[PDB]
Amino acid sequence: SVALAPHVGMGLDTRAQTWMSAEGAWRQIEKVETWAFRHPGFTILALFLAHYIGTSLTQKVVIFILLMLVTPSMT
Amino acid sequence: SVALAPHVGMGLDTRAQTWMSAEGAWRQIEKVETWAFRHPGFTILALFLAHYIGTSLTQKVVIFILLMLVTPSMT
Amino acid sequence: SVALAPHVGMGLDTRAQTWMSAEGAWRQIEKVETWAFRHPGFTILALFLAHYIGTSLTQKVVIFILLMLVTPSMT
Amino acid sequence: SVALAPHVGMGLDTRAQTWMSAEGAWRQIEKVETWAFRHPGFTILALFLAHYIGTSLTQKVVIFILLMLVTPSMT
Amino acid sequence: MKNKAWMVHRQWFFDLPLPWTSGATTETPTWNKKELLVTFKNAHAKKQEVVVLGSQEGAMHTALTGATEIQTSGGTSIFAGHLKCRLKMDKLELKGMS
Amino acid sequence: TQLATLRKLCIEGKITNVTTDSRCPTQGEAILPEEQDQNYVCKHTYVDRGWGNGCGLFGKGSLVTCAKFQCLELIEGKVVQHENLKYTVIITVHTGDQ
Amino acid sequence: MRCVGVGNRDFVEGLSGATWVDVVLEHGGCVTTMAKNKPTLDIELQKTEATQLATLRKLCIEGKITNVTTDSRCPTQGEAILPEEQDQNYVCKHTYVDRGWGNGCGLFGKGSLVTCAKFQCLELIEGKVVQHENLKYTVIITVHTGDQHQVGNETQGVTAEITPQASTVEAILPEYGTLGLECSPRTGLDFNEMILLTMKNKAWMVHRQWFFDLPLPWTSGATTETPTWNKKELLVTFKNAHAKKQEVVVLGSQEGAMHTALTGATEIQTSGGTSIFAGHLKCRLKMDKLELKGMSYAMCSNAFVLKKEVSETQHGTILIKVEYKGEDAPCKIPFSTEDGQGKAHNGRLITANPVVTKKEELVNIEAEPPFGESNIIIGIGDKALRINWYKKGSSIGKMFEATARGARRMAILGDTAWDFGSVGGVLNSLGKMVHQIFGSAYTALFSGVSWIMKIGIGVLLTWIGLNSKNTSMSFSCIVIGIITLYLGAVVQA
Amino acid sequence: MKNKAWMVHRQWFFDLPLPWTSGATTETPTWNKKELLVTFKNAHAKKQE
Amino acid sequence: GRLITANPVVTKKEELVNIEAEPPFGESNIIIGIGDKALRINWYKKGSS
Ligand SMILES: *[C@@H]1O[C@H](CO)[C@@H](O[C@@H]2O[C@H](CO)[C@@H](O)[C@H](O)[C@H]2NC(C)=O)[C@H](O)[C@H]1NC(C)=O
Numbered sequence A, B, C, D: 001s002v003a004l005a006p007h008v009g010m011g012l013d014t015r016a017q018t019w020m021s022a023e024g025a026w027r028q029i030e031k032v033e034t035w036a037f038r039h040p041g042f043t044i045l046a047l048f049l050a051h052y053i054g055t056s057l058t059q060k061v062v063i064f065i066l067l068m069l070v071t072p073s074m075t
Numbered sequence E: 001m002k003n004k005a006w007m008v009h010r011q012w013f014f015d016l017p018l019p020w021t022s023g024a025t026t027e028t029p030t031w032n033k034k035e036l037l038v039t040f041k042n043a044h045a046k047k048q049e050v051v052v053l054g055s056q057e058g059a060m061h062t063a064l065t066g067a068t069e070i071q072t073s074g075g076t077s078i079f080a081g082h083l084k085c086r087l088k089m090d091k092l093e094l095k096g097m098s
Numbered sequence F: 001t002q003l004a005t006l007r008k009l010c011i012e013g014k015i016t017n018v019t020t021d022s023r024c025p026t027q028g029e030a031i032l033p034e035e036q037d038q039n040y041v042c043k044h045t046y047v048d049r050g051w052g053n054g055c056g057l058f059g060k061g062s063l064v065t066c067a068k069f070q071c072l073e074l075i076e077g078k079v080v081q082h083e084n085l086k087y088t089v090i091i092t093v094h095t096g097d098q
Numbered sequence G: 001m002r003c004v005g006v007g008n009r010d011f012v013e014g015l016s017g018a019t020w021v022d023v024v025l026e027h028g029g030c031v032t033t034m035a036k037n038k039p040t041l042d043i044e045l046q047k048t049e050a051t052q053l054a055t056l057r058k059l060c061i062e063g064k065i066t067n068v069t070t071d072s073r074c075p076t077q078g079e080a081i082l083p084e085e086q087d088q089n090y091v092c093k094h095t096y097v098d099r100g101w102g103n104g105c106g107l108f109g110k111g112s113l114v115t116c117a118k119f120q121c122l123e124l125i126e127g128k129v130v131q132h133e134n135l136k137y138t139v140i141i142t143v144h145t146g147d148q149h150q151v152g153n154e155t156q157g158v159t160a161e162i163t164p165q166a167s168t169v170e171a172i173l174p175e176y177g178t179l180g181l182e183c184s185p186r187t188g189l190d191f192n193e194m195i196l197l198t199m200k201n202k203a204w205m206v207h208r209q210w211f212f213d214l215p216l217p218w219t220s221g222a223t224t225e226t227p228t229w230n231k232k233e234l235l236v237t238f239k240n241a242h243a244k245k246q247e248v249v250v251l252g253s254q255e256g257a258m259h260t261a262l263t264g265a266t267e268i269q270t271s272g273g274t275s276i277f278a279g280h281l282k283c284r285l286k287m288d289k290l291e292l293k294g295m296s297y298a299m300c301s302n303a304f305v306l307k308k309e310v311s312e313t314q315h316g317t318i319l320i321k322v323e324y325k326g327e328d329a330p331c332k333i334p335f336s337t338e339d340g341q342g343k344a345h346n347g348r349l350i351t352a353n354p355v356v357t358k359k360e361e362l363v364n365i366e367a368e369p370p371f372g373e374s375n376i377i378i379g380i381g382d383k384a385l386r387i388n389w390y391k392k393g394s395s396i397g398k399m400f401e402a403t404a405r406g407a408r409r410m411a412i413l414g415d416t417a418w419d420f421g422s423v424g425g426v427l428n429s430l431g432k433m434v435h436q437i438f439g440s441a442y443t444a445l446f447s448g449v450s451w452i453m454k455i456g457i458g459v460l461l462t463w464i465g466l467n468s469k470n471t472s473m474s475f476s477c478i479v480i481g482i483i484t485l486y487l488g489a490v491v492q493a
Numbered sequence H: 001m002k003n004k005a006w007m008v009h010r011q012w013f014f015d016l017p018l019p020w021t022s023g024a025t026t027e028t029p030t031w032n033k034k035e036l037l038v039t040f041k042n043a044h045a046k047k048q049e
Numbered sequence I: 001g002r003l004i005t006a007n008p009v010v011t012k013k014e015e016l017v018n019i020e021a022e023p024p025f026g027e028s029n030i031i032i033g034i035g036d037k038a039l040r041i042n043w044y045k046k047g048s049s
């Protein structure tokens, strides 16, 4: 839909506050947190996938974080 | 917003077509493709990040795909 | 009496709701948090004191947390 | 309440004696002593915790003092 | 919605960033979390102006994707359901056996 | 047969009665008497004040602007009591009619 | 418009040569130019308005649907056709449904079905690009004369119109000479790659390529009586139900979803003729012809009296309100800043020539005091009024504050910020060039990255740098990660 | 308080939890954060006081 | 900045004359007069060499 492609990250940055800067700064984080806390089961699956693909701890953490962020956002 | 949390992946699945099944099945993929083709520069950055974190090719591909999916969707 | 010694530690307890349980549960932690926010330099001082006395991370962490809990409360 | 956050330590010292200096100088110490006297067993518990967390004698005594100070004031 | 109902899982309708009410059929409602609609723009940090964000009808319609629709004409009639009737055919005779 | 309304979100919103109170930078948070009114929705912001704004002390001062809120349209979620359902099974006879 | 206490006033001092200073004017905040033996000026870009707008494309947000039709075919007979598919007014999709002797078909199976319905948009959004040479930059230039009423007064100043047709404008200041503005209206915000849509009485400034990528049905925007909507399938939704019949309904008003999708896009005024706020201009100030008012007056021989308590601006600058009780009305205000325990003249005026114009009139004197306790004398003789003040903070504090302010200025402005207050300079130009190259390279990489995703990538880059054995690569990754964290923490102003 | 006055640090004064209003000499004002001087207790789970 | 139209001569002084010029890739101010009455056109040519 239209809301799925916000006008963020574009090259037009000025002094004045953008439209819904304060509200739109944390909406993605809030929705990710709500989905994660409403589907706690997927946390262990993400941990499992990260652990059997990340050879080092840094790779494990990167893959786990990316899986945690992508799945609610693809919802 | 409201549209950022679609009613998908829930446990209520029946025979009848859901509301906007055909339209809503591919909206995320379409928006990811549009963002990727409108910001081709980020592709090489994602490749760079995947290559300096993925020891094996499978880890490289997983990290690259996850970075490609997450960044437009967090937009 | 003075609020410094509330009747929270006595062994007597029951099924019924205690007087001002909802507030008194988190009153002390709220005071500690607001004191910490008001005076952030003592965080640095406690970090230094814990780092120069705690050989192990357990020792340093316990000293830091105890020292950050005493000063707002012993004031 | 408001009595738990006294106006102590704020940089407004003057030559004139402050309000309730004599009492408020020692109210905290009196509270700690009366709690440590009405609940002797916590002295044993704090000695155990300090012994099993304090490698050196100075660390042991610091942990023991901090434990016997935080708990009366966290009541 | 408005003349278009849907069947939604319970815990999602409790997680919609829209201001709710008790639903007590009260004359004057008390909207909770009203900050979701109204947006407060501080402009150039010299004055604050408040405006409504607009009709959430399209965004809600989008957010309802994957949710089975339902008839609401007259009394509600839930289609898209399943039942587990067990058929006991003890007493079924045939017409023309004679 | 019968539906019990459990919670009613709203989708559109109209805003009226915009108010605003300001304080000088050091004087602290600004308060409108209408914050305690559940009808109004509002947020505190910090703006710059000075001799051009009527304040005697330069700096950033607090500011809160409270405005009325009512929802023109609403969405009306209404749970179904699990024992007021009516499953209508239609059973043909497969008689070989024309 | 003589802003003091705006908190973004951005003092600019000095002149390269031939008496001109290059400055960049932004909507939020002023610039304060105080050269030697020139009147000080508090200049800013007041508003930019587009005189005439050309509508380029008009999406629609609501939609009404009428004249629903439907044609069906038996399973093997192929695709169904309505005569109205070729009509651009109607929107429709083919679906497969089951047919049989109960549906009138003689052959069982799944048959094609198409249902075409009329479409018209009740409300529309009306994106309308701005011609880059019909702009009008209105720079308001105060004189900072020390009047009684202008301390933060936003209605007093001199107005100069800056357009690409006539960029260089000499704004005649009253009794202070003619300031020379050599401006550059063509390099501000790149309005060519912006579309400035209007919604309904609420316009916004949007980057060009995003308004072309909105999943809403558009039009040509030709002000035609009957429009031809393209990609109408985005609004209307076709539900095949239980694969036995197809029903079409409108998806509803996209106003809230579009309002959400406009987050991060700077708003804009649309009352009357459009007036673009939130812009920046690069006017270069040529102060050849700026004279002072009272250079020919004498010195005041009588005392002064404070009429309002002195206060400190967010930038450490004090303001003084004195009234001169003396008979020689045209005069000069003696002003010496005596330091603490020493008579060192360490504090300097920000009002070029503090002048009393009338006996009754009050005068506002602006002066930057030293970072320590410092008395200030406003009069002559032993009966001179002496203002005592204690400005708090240290010179290291001002250095850190200025560094952070410049970093922010470079964040919003980019390469153009190198030209702010840039009196000529040859090393400065080289820094601007290298920053241009690196900024283009960075903007190519990090375009379209979010508030949090920028911080995440910055943290990842920093971690990669810390664990990179290659010293050059490690240093590069750490340096780029730190600035990426900064940009992520400052983005979306 | 009544006939007694004190010098208190302004930040501490703003921090101390008590219901407060604009102080605009208006009879019957509205007290922000007035929940600090009321406590609601459940008689087990039957009722509210 | 080069000048494509080789010699911009005004033939009649009543018929308006048009000139084609090639500006530099940076911002450039074009002057079509002798004194301070000179018409000054500034153009910003976006691009790179
Ligand atoms: C909120 O605003 C409305 C209108 O904007 C105010 O209505 C006024 O009501 C009084 C009598 O109740 C009339 O005499 C005025 O003419 C109305 N104002 C108009 C029509 O502009 C209302 O008083 C405001 N305040 C509240 C609390 O509702």
Ligand SMILES: *[C@@H]1O[C@H](CO)[C@@H](O[C@@H]2O[C@H](CO)[C@@H](O)[C@H](O)[C@H]2NC(C)=O)[C@H](O)[C@H]1NC(C)=O
Residues within 6 Å of the ligand: G066, G067
């Ligand atoms: C589309 O539908 C409208 C109404 O739904 C049709 O309008 C009819 O128009 C004729 C004359 O033009 C009237 O005699 C009818 O009474 C109208 N129908 C009504 C009012 O229901 C229209 O003909 C349909 N087709 C087109 C191509 O517009």
Ligand SMILES: *[C@@H]1O[C@H](CO)[C@@H](O[C@@H]2O[C@H](CO)[C@@H](O)[C@H](O)[C@H]2NC(C)=O)[C@H](O)[C@H]1NC(C)=O
Residues within 6 Å of the ligand: F052, G149, G150, G153, G154, G155, G156
């Ligand atoms: C800003 O400047 C204007 C004009 O200099 C001031 O308007 C003057 O106000 C005084 C008294 O307040 C009057 O005696 C003058 O006649 C006014 N001049 C006008 C209206 O042209 C104004 O007061 C200043 N301050 C503010 C806050 O606007």
